[PDB]
Amino acid sequence: SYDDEELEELLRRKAAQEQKRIEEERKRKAELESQKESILRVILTPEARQRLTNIKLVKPEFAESLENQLIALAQSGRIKIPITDEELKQILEQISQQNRRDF
Ligand code: NA
């Protein structure tokens, strides 16, 4: 009927669904981020992992993309493991130079 009582409890159903949706998003990101850090501990040297942790503080979206890509590169076996801070700096300089030529 969409009388007042139905609108009230449909909108309550929406608040409950948004809360659940957002609680589930917060939980999934925390657990997946935990497992990505467990991979980064083994695939990066301590100094390289420290640099990526620092990048995540200042450029979180960039850092999340870079984590996913380093994890894929390591799984692929194409690159020697662990990735050193020197090697991570070369990857970052390559990204920087590739985006200057596309600026
Ligand atoms: Na290193």
Curated annotation (Swiss-Prot):
Keywords tagged on the record:
DNA-binding
A GO molecular-function descriptor: DNA binding
Matching entries from Gene3D superfamilies are given as: PDCD5-like
* Ranges that cross the membrane: none
Identify the GO cellular component terms for this protein: cytosol
Q: Which domain of life is it from?
A: Archaea
**Which InterPro entries does the annotation name?**
DNA_bind_arc, PDCD5-like, PDCD5-like_sf
The record's similarity note reads: Belongs to the PDCD5 family.
Q: Which HAMAP family match?
A: dsDNA_bind
Protein's UniProt name: DNA-binding protein SSO0352
Query: What organism, scientifically named, is this protein from?
Result: Saccharolobus solfataricus (strain ATCC 35092 / DSM 1617 / JCM 11322 / P2) (Sulfolobus solfataricus)
